[PDB]
Amino acid sequence: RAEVEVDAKTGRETIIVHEIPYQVNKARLIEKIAELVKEKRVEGISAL
DNA sequence: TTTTTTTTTTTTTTTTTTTTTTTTTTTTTTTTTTTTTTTTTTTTTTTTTTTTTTTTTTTTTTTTTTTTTTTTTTTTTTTTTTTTTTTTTTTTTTTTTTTTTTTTTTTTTTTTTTTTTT
């Protein structure tokens, strides 16, 4: 369960993951996202 | 009772190999330096009515040099073949899940002994 929050003051967008699937480790999920960002397999991510 | 044959581990130290300490080259990483975006206000630029004298298009006619034109022979175009690259099925390998089998390490505290350095 995630939403693309859109700022009102500026046009920048931030994705917020409210919930996570079952039997998924959050630390490994964040590490995998960081690995994809470093390898440029997923584009558009600014921060994490 | 004396004397004779044979067997191996040691005096071994040297040759071969292995193990363990080393430091050149392409791939990371922190720094400074240059591209981007948002506000203030500011003289400055720029949008929109009115008048005006202008200078280019439309009555009409003229020609000549680009539009007609036909035809020879080139030469770009197309065909077949083969190589190089791109891209996707296929396979392999690895990781995570939850109950099982196995293990392995770092320090305090005192007192006494080995074990090196001066």
Side-chain angles (χ1 to χ4, degrees), chain A residues 20-36:
Chain A
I20 195 173
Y22 182 57
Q23 294 177 350
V24 173
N25 185 18
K26 183 169 66 170
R28 279 197 296 275
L29 176 56
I30 291 159
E31 287 179 19
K32 186 65 174 294
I33 293 157
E35 285 174 14
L36 294 185

Side-chain angles (χ1 to χ4, degrees), chain A residues 28-48:
Chain A
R28 279 197 296 275
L29 176 56
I30 291 159
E31 287 179 19
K32 186 65 174 294
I33 293 157
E35 285 174 14
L36 294 185
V37 168
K38 284 185 287 185
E39 297 182 2
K40 307 186 179 183
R41 287 172 56 76
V42 175
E43 300 295 344
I45 292 158
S46 179
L48 179 63

Side-chain angles (χ1 to χ4, degrees), chain A residues 9-27:
Chain A
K9 302 295 188 299
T10 61
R12 305 205 73 179
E13 305 182 23
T14 67
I15 293 157
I16 292 156
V17 182
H18 302 279
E19 304 177 348
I20 195 173
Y22 182 57
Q23 294 177 350
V24 173
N25 185 18
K26 183 169 66 170

